[PDB]
Each structure stands twice: as C-alpha cells, then as structure tokens.
Nucleic acid binder design. Structure first.
Ligand SMILES: [Mg+2]
Ligand SMILES: [Mg+2]
Lengths: 189, 146, 52, 67, 145, 57, 73, 64, 55, 143
RNA sequence: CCAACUUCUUAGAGGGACAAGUGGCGUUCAGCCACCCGAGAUUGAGCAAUAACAGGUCUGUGAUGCCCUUAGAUGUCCGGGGCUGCACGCGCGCUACACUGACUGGCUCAGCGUGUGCCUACCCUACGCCGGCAGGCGCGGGUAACCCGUUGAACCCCAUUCGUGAUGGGGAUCGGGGAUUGCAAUUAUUCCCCAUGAACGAGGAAUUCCCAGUAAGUGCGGGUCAUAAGCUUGCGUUGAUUAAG
C-alpha cells in the first residue's frame, strides 16, 4: 500500500516467529516510503521496537567514523541492495530480510566477571530485542568486513550475505559466527 | 487584476534545526514550487518521496485548488526538506480552518497524525552548545595519568 | 588562572549592549530640551544632523 | 525529581489555613488567587506553590489532614 | 573500443631508462619516469594531441616517439616556464625539464656543491639530518639507529 | 576627529570608569572613600564622590 | 590472488558474449572476479552490451550500475 | 536428549541480577499451561508480557 | 644614551611594543576591543568594565 | 508551454548549454586553456578537454540567478576544499584569471554587461536564448 | 503617501507547565510508574557552604616582608646566538592506511561572530584590470541589522575516470623556481609551482571520553596576529548503533 522505495508493498511479508512479532515493525502502522525519519528513539526505552527495521538497518550501516553521519549515503546502499536481492530471488525483499532477522539472531550467550572459563561462563538466554539488535549488528558487520579489500560493491556484498543468511548456510558471516555463540554457550551450559 | 476574491491566502512556516520555510498558498489550480522550481525537481532527490509526501497520502486531484509556493532560508540540505515537508502540510491544514469547514481539516489532520506527527509539529531540539573542556558538547579531551 | 597550574577552567565574560532607534519630523530647535528632560547616567543618546 | 521543597510546602500551607474560603480544585483559578494574595517573587514558584494547593484540595475534602 | 586487442601489444616499453608497464594508460603509464609526474604527463599528451583514454601498449612507435620527443624538450612545445623542474638552473641559467638519471645527476650535484663550500644545508646532507628546519628532539627517529 | 565604534565606545568609558576608581582609591583611602559615580553629558561632565569624611577631602 | 588482465583475448570475449547476458544479476563487480578481467573493462564492455540489445539497465547510479538478463519469454 | 526449541511467555520481572546489572529474572510460562512455569534469566531489554524462545528449557536458576 | 642608537630597535609590530596600560606587562595581554590589559589583569576590573558573567 | 530555466534539471542544462556553445564557435577561448589546473585546491588538470564551454555554461547560469556578480564572487562559487597534505583541510577560493577570462569571453558573445554598481548582469539578449535552449532540453527529457 | 501589513526577521513586555489532568502503585503519607492534552511532562550553563591543602603562582601586578645585588651592577640599552639543538623514552594532537573511496566536472544549503588604533604604525574588503598560481595595481564602501554578505563553508548529492596492486590510497622526505610580511626570513616565517613518492594493510599489553541533536564526520569564526593554527575557545551542518542498569 505504501511501497517502500516506491515499489515492493508490505502486505505479503509475514513474520513467522511469534517471539518477534512485537519487535519487527514492517506492518502498515509502521510502513513508510523510504527509511529516513527524525528519530527521537533514545529518549525513552522500548520505542526502538516500533522503529521500522529498514530504518534500523540503514542506521546501523554507517559505522566506522569516516562514514559516520552520512545517512543519505547509506539510504541508497539499502535502496540498491533490495534491488540486487529481487533479481537473485524474485521475492519481495522485505520478506527475505525478515527471514535473515530470524535466522541470524542468536538464542544463547553467556555472562560472568569471574574466573573466565572460555570468555563468559554462566550461559544465559536472550531477550527478544537483543536478538534483533544482534541480528542487524551481525548482518551489517559481516557485509562490511567482506568488502574492505574487494572489487565487490558494499551494495552487492550487503545483498549477497543476507539472502545467504535468510536461507541459512553458514556461508554468510551472520550465520557462521552466531553458531559460535551458541556453541560456546553450550560449552558452558 | 484583483477583480475576484482579493487575498484569500495564508502563509505558514515550518522549522528544522537552523532552518525555516514559509509556504505562501492562495486559491488556485494545482501549482506547487519551492524557490521557483517544482517539487519533483528538488536538489537531494534521494529523499524525493518525503517532500512530496503530503501530496501522496492526501491526493493530487482532490487537493489541487491551492497554489502553494515556498521560500526557504537557513539550515542545510536535509533540514530544508524537512522544513518544506512540515510547512506545506500545515499550510493547507491552516488553509482549511479559514476558508472551508474544519470538518475537512479534522478529516485531513486524521491522516497526518496517525502517520508520523512531525508534519505539523515543530521538532524542538537544537544546537546544544559546546563547553570549555572538550572538543564537543559532552565529550572531553583524553585524560592521561602517567 | 593567573598561572598555568590548574585543571583548565574558563570564565566567559560577556557584555550585551542594546540599542533602539526612533524617528521624528520635529523642528530641530526643540530637540535640545528633549535632550534636557533628564540626565539618566545609563544611556547614550545621539541626535542625527538636521540636514536630513 | 518532582519532590517539592520546604518553602513551597510551608508557604502553601499558610494559604489553605488562611484563604480556604476563596480556593477550589482548579489549578488555573488558584494560580490567579495566590498571585493576588501572596507576594511571590518569581513565576516558577508561583505555580509550583499553587500546584501543591490543589493537591491539598482533594486531600482535605476527604478527612482530617493537618488542616 | 578494443573489443579484443590489436595485433601488437607491448608488455613493457623502453622509454629512457625506465620500462613502463603496458596495462596502465598513458596519462598514468609514463609517470614511472623520474621527472614525469602525474601533472606533467597529462600536459605533454595534450600537446601530443593524443586520446587520453588509450592504454599503454596500444600506441604505435610514432606515438611513442612523439611523446618522448615532446617531453625531452618541452620548452618549444608551448609548455610554460614555471611548469618545468629546472627553472633558472644555478650552473647554466636555462629552463629545462629533467627526466632521467640526469634528474639524479642534478639532484645530487646540488648536494655535493653545498657540501663543497660547506653551506649549512650541505652539512645536514652530509650527516643524516633534516634540512628544512624540522625539529629533531622527538621525530625522525627511524632514520638514525 | 573620526569617532570609533559602539563596541569600543563602551569599553573606553568603562576603562575610563575603572581608571579613576583606582586613583581615587589611592588618594581618598585615609579619608573614607567608598566609591564614585559618573555622569557623561555633552557639556560639563559631573563626577560625584561617595566619601564618608567629606570634611577631609 | 593478484593481477588480472585488460583488453580481452578471444577466449574470454566469446565466453563473455555467450553467458554473461544469461544470468540474473550482472554488474561490473561481478565479471571482474568471475572472469579474469580486472574491471574498468567490466564497466566498458558491459556498457556496450546495453548498446547492442543483449541486456537491460535498471539503476545507473554513479556508485552502482545494475543490469540483468533480457526478457526470455 | 533432543528437546523441542520451546517458546515461553513471561510473568512479572524479578529485577536485575548478575553482578553488573546485566541479567533479569523473568519466570516464564510455557504457552501450553500456566501451571508449568520455571524461573530463568535473560539478558537485554525485556518488556513484561512478551515471548522469548528457550533453546533448552530446564537446567538451573540463581541459588547458592 | 648617545641618542642616535639608544632606543634604536624598532618597537613596532609584535609583542615588543604592546603593553598593559594597567599592569605594564607584555605577556598574555588582550588587545581585543582596544583593552590592552594583562589577562591576569583583566579579571580584577572586569566587573568595573561592565563585563558581567552569566550571573 | 512557457518553460523557463528554473523548472529544468540544471545539472544537464549545463550539458545542454555547453553543447550549444561548442557548435556556436563564437567564444574567445584563451591560449593557455590546456595547462590550467582550475583553482589550486585541486591537484590534476581538468579531465574533459573542452572544459571552457561547461565553465561558460555554468558561469552564465549562476549569473542569470545572481545579479551583480563579479570575478571575486565567481571564485567563491567555484572554490572547493583544499587538502593541505598532513595539516587539516581548508576551504580555498576559486581561480581569478580563469573566471575573468570567461566573463570577458561572454562579453564578446554579448550575453553579459557591466552594471551601475560593480559587477556584471546579463542583457535581455542573454536570457532570451538560454531560456530558448531551456525549453529544448526540457523537451529533450521526453525526446 | 506615486500601497498595505507583521507570517517569516530583530526584540521588549506579558503568557505558558504545575507532576496539573487521568488510571495503577504507595501507610492511600511523601512520591513513583503509566498515559491524554500539549511546543515542551528531566534544555543547557552559571554562581555555589563549613573546615582545609605547607597544591600552584614572588616570571603576570607601584600587592609585599626579609635576604642578595647596586656601576668591571643581577639596572638598562644595543648587536649576534639560544630557548627549534638529537643514539632514545613519554604525553596532548593532525593525516592516514582506501572502492561506504580517490579524482575530474557539475550542483545546491549555514550559524556564532569580528572589523581603521589616545599613545599605536598597521582594519574588513567589494568591483575593475593585469598574472597559469600565490599575488600586483587602479578604484570604491564600511566606525557597521547601513558595507564585505542574501557571509553561494565543507561533507553530503549528481555524472566522470580509476579497478584490490603499497595503485591515481597515503603525501612524509627532498631539489629547483616564483611571491608576500618585515629592520632582517640563514637554522628553511608563511604561501605558490614543478619534480621527488617514505613508512603505513586497522595497530599486543594497557587505556580514554561519551548515552540525544549526544558520539562522530565535516567545515566556519574569535584569541594569539606584521606574518600566521596541526592549539584553544565558540558556531552551524550531517547525524547514530548501544543504554533507562
Ligand atoms: Mg606579578
Ligand atoms: Mg581497495
């Protein structure tokens, strides 16, 4: 109805995990034309969940200082990367992102300050917003360290990892590394 | 030629950090431009949908009896397109409380409030000065001990 | 600080000076008694030349 | 951060002890009365005193407060 | 326009004493010459009336000769006088662009000249010191041992 | 001659005001000085002391 | 793990014009690593295939040019 | 041995824990009965009433 | 003396000629707005100048 | 209908107007045009070899929008950011004697005149034909 | 009067928000947590106690005790030199290690502020004409909401070229030249041009600042100033990831 970046309406997209229906904000109440809005989200907590994930995917993309406030420069990175996605697949690219949000967010990790077995010891669960935060952080990081010495564009290297993570193959960085979290959480489970 | 309906118009401003944009809008026939040039012909164009966004979810042919034109002063390239987005939203909102019923104004404010309230409320946050001990407003120079 | 020792403090003096401006089409002789209404130690008044 | 100082509470108690015949449970009316009937040096503690008065308005219509 | 390649393509050329790479393009291929910078190379080519987008191994030997001929004595091909290296040289009074081992000749000659008459610039060349008035209390460490 | 700007009008009279306050401290200290107060006019300008022992000045 | 080559041989150019207008995503960053050309030709040769009529243009951005296969059915 | 990866909704949050203020005790309910309810500890921001997914369900809570 | 070259070095441009009218120092003085007072010197009289702080 | 220049895409209006000035070979192009570097905050030559027409198209279009503009203000609109090597970068002015040579060039082309005060405006002969090719290139968006 | 008016701009006065309203919690005490209305439901800084420090500053001061020295003077002036000297170690900081880039050309946006002086010379600069560049002249304006200036700031944006290579990344080092300031530029003042093209591939232990227009990017203006900012103190621009423990 609102057609994020002018096309690809957000009616067909379906969030499969009930654990993340309150936290991924693709639906029509929180569906915009393009991911740019004056935020005001770290005034009070738990309103960064009704911030749309395309806004949170393009805010977590400007990272390493040299490209740090360049938000109109990363809003075209996501704009083309949906369009690379639709050519390799033929899916509404909002759906293949929200599969990668499910598939890359972990389920176990660990915390101790004391007598560190491997890194952290008491293996704890995860709240279902940190697994979204560590979904997009795992996607944006892994798309980035795999285009630092590469002829490949950061636009395609973004696209070619999250459809590689939405399918789930340990071939993207967001899948092959998240398993090391749950492995080492099993190693001190 | 002032022969019919003299000065049936409003002039409404909207603001961004270090910016303003006051939209003069008369009675007329579907004409919108910013500093002379049209709305689809604006400079950034990556943010093209969110300055013709009050056109989109309101309706072109429906609300084309008005001849909005905007002058913009101060700020920067992103703050001056949120300025005209806020302005011409609340320009024709302020135009309908004066020349038609507010039954239509509440009918169009109903769209523009469930859809991201900032179109006719001013974003209050501003520059927030630097202090005398750091390179920025909160940050400080690197403390050394040895 | 008078010296270099300290923890990098700074005092920011300022002086805000206001100024207002008023026109009259008066005959330029009675402006002398308009000046001579009061002494008023705070203000600084100046009358523009009568050659317009 | 809401919690009100000793001079707001003390000076508001001397109103309701003394001018209860003129006050009510509206903020904007009592804000005008305490302006007229006390000498408040500035506007912020004018309507910060008057807020505790109206808080004392619903409080004393129930029972024996320090009243 | 080369959809495949023409029949001859030099892997490396042979220019003055420097063998330039052939996969570069001519604006940036001849910059291996000590004396031909990134700036002087484009100016010679525009006076050579060549297309700047042509690659290096696909110039015929007339073009390679005409590029070498212009940069040997550019003072008559209307390249201006404060665009050259040796403006008003301190031994002969001429204006010349130097491009070869002769660049390093006139490079070192000024060192040993000042070292001969013992100017303060030449004494800091004879040692391992900085010339252009830098500090040395804290920098330039890994030149000396 | 030519007159100088309003920013440097207002630091000139203050450093006028600061200077004679420092001298009239040094003179009238034994006679109970306690300040001055100035009036600039486009005439005779009138400067008043605030001495306590006005008999001694 | 190092240098590729500019100015196509015959063995890549016929290999280009047989399968590079077939698959679904095609970009100068793709053929400068799927083939042994280095790029700058990936832009140059894939530009003139748009001139022939073998592929379609989508994006045409200064940082990213995106092509695809042509209409088959 | 092989357990279902079970989802479970939280009741009242039992405050922070974990010696840095990093873990929150939640007391989940297992979506099929509210009578079966184990106290567990998650990290990150919680929001009472939502649903989180256990990778393995019953091991241990905080008691010395 | 011998007045031809007693005071012969040109006190002109540069901090060999700027001085504090009030304190007679040449270091750190403030030549903004024609003050020409010593910076250490500036703090004393700044209330007498008419320079208030924030309050 | 009546289409002026303000409602046309003006990155490529310059691409239209420079293509007019090249085929209308009535421009006094200076003799040092190929060794220029264009305002010393940049370190290479201009890439396009006939850069003087797209400078003349650009310096005419701003002069349409800004009256009274001299060579001193034309250097404040073609300037950019000089990287100073190891020191912090700073803004620097444009080039004076290439902005002078283009305004004198348009004066022989009769599209600019001097003013009552300092600076230059354009004659009604000047605007009547860059609005003419403004209508062409707005039609060339469809064509 | 050959028009009116104050939305935008600059102020001045008064207004406005109080945890007030409404649920929930709480001894139904203080208050807390939620919301509605609202521009705003914690804007940011100043001042800032008692008692102290053998903290710093006698090289800031005609604030000052005591001592020392007082003419072959520790006074003062003048000429040169040094405070920049380098086998090394440390602390602030700039530029980077590139393709989310660098070029080249288009394109459009700021705010804070400062400007000709008693001594004390010298200011901000429009415009025109020479110069390929710094700059050089002629001619104006401004003691300033009067002029520079509608401060066409940079990043960003659009097209171009370059292709994972210590490469057009990076620009240290170094040679030759041209100009400006000055009594004087050598131990290079700065600036400009050509040429030269060094480490450097995200940095071990350790450690710093910060939680919203914040961090950070990016430029701009004060101070110093004859010449001058890699420093400082201010400004706007772009603008967040994390967190309410
Ligand atoms: Mg002293
Ligand atoms: Mg690379």
């Amino acid at each position: 109805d609102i057609k994020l970046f002018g096309k690809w309406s957000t009616d067909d997209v379906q969030i499969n995990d009930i654990s993340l229906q309150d936290y991924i904000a693709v639906k029509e109440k929180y569906a915009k034309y393009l991911p740019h809005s004056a935020g005001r989200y770290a005034a009070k907590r738990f309103r960064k969940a009704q911030c749309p994930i395309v806004e949170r995917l393009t805010n977590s993309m400007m990272m390493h200082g040299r490209n740090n406030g360049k938000k109109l420069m990363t809003v075209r990175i996501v704009k083309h990367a949906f369009e690379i996605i639709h050519l390799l697949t033929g899916e509404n690219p909002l759906q293949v992102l929200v599969n990668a949000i499910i598939n890359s967010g972990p389920r176990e990790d660990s915390t101790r300050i004391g007598r560190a077995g491997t890194v952290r010891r008491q293996a704890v669960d995860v709240s279902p917003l940190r697994r979204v935060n560590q979904a997009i952080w795992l996607l944006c990081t892994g798309a980035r360290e795999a285009a630092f010495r590469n002829i490949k564009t950061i636009a395609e290297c973004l696209a070619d990892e999250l459809i590689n993570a939405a399918k789930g193959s340990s071939n993207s960085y967001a899948i092959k590394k998240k398993d090391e979290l749950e492995r080492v959480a099993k190693s001190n489970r | 030629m002032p022969s019919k309906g003299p000065l049936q118009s409003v002039q409404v401003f909207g603001r961004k950090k270090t910016a303003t944009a006051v939209a003069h809008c008369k009675r007329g026939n579907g004409l919108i431009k910013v500093n002379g040039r049209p709305l689809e012909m604006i400079e950034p164009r990556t943010l093209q949908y969110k300055l013709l966004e009050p056109v989109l979810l309101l309706g072109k042919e429906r609300f084309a009896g008005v001849d909005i034109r905007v002058r913009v002063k101060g700020g920067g390239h992103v703050a001056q397109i949120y300025a005209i987005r806020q302005s011409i939203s609340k320009a024709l909102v302020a135009y309908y409380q004066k020349y038609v019923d507010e039954a239509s104004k509440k009918e169009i404010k109903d769209i523009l409030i469930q859809y991201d309230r900032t179109l006719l409320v001013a974003d209050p946050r501003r520059c927030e000065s630097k202090k005398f001990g750091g390179p920025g407003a909160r940050a400080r120079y690197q403390k050394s001990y040895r | 600080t008078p010296c270099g020792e300290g923890s990098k403090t700074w005092d920011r003096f300022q002086m805000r000076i206001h100024k207002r401006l008023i026109d009259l089409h008066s005959p330029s002789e009675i402006v002398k008694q308009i000046t001579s209404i009061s002494i008023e130690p705070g203000v600084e008044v100046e009358v523009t030349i009568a050659d317009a | 951060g809401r919690v009100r100082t000793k001079t707001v509470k003390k000076a508001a108690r001397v109103i309701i002890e003394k001018y209860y015949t003129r006050l009510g449970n509206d903020f904007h009316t009592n804000k005008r009365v305490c302006e007229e009937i006390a000498i408040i040096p500035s506007k912020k503690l004018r309507n910060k005193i008057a807020g505790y008065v109206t808080h004392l308005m619903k409080r004393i219509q129930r029972g024996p407060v320090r009243g | 326009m080369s959809l495949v390649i023409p029949e001859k393509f030099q892997h490396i050329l042979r220019v003055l004493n420097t063998n330039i790479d052939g996969r570069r393009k001519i604006a940036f291929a001849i910059t291996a010459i000590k004396g031909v910078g990134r700036r002087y190379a484009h100016v010679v080519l525009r006076k050579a009336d060549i297309d700047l987008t042509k690659r290096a191994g696909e110039l015929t030997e007339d073009e390679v000769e005409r590029v070498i001929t212009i940069m040997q004595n550019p003072r008559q091909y209307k390249i201006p006088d404060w665009f050259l290296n040796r403006q008003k040289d301190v031994k002969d009074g001429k204006y010349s662009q130097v491009l070869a081992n002769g660049l390093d000749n006139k490079l070192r000659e000024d060192l040993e000249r000042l070292k001969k008459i013992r100017a303060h610039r030449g004494l800091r060349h004879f040692w391992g010191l900085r010339v252009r008035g830098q500090h040395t209390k804290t920098t330039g460490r890994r030149g000396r041992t | 001659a030519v007159q100088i700007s309003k920013k440097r009008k207002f630091v000139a009279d203050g450093i006028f005001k600061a200077e004679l306050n420092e001298f009239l401290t040094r003179e009238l200290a034994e006679d109970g000085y306690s300040g001055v107060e100035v009036r600039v006019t486009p005439t005779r300008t009138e400067i008043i002391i605030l001495a306590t022992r006005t008999q001694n000045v | 793990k190092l240098n590729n080559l500019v100015l196509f041989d015959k063995a890549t150019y016929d290999k280009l014009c047989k399968e590079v207008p077939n698959y679904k995503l095609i970009t100068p960053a793709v053929v400068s690593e799927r083939l042994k050309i280095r790029g700058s030709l990936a832009r140059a040769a894939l530009q003139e295939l748009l001139s022939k009529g073998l592929i379609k243009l989508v994006s045409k951005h200064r940082a990213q040019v995106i092509y695809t296969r042509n209409t088959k059915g | 041995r092989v357990q279902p990866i079970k989802l479970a909704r939280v009741t009242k949050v039992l405050g922070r824990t974990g010696s840095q203020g990093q873990c929150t005790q939640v007391r989940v309910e297992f979506m099929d009965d509210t009578s079966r309810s184990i106290i567990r500890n998650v990290k990150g921001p919680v929001r009472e009433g939502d649903v989180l997914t256990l990778l393995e369900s019953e091991r241990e809570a905080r008691r010395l | 003396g011998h007045q031809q070259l007693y005071w012969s070095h040109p006190r002109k441009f540069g901090q060999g000629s700027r001085s504090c009218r009030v304190c007679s120092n040449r270091h750190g003085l403030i030549r903004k707005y024609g003050l020409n007072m010593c910076r250490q010197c500036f703090r004393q009289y700044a209330k007498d100048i008419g320079f208030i702080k924030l309050d | 209908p009546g289409v002026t220049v303000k409602d046309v895409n003006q990155q490529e209006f310059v691409r239209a107007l420079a293509a007019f000035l090249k085929k209308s070979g009535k421009l006094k192009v200076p003799e040092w045009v190929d060794t220029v570097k264009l305002a010393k905050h940049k370190e290479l030559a201009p890439y396009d070899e006939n850069w003087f027409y797209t400078r003349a198209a650009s310096t005419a279009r701003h002069l349409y929008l800004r009256g009274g503009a001299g060579v001193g203000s034309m250097t404040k609109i073609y300037g950019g950011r000089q990287r100073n090597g190891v020191m912090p970068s700073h803004f620097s002015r444009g080039s004076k004697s290439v902005a002078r040579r283009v305004l004198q060039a348009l004066e022989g082309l009769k599209m600019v005149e001097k003013d009552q005060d300092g600076g230059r405006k354009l004659t009604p002969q000047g605007q009547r034909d860059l609005d003419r090719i403004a209508g062409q290139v707005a039609a060339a968006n469809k064509k």
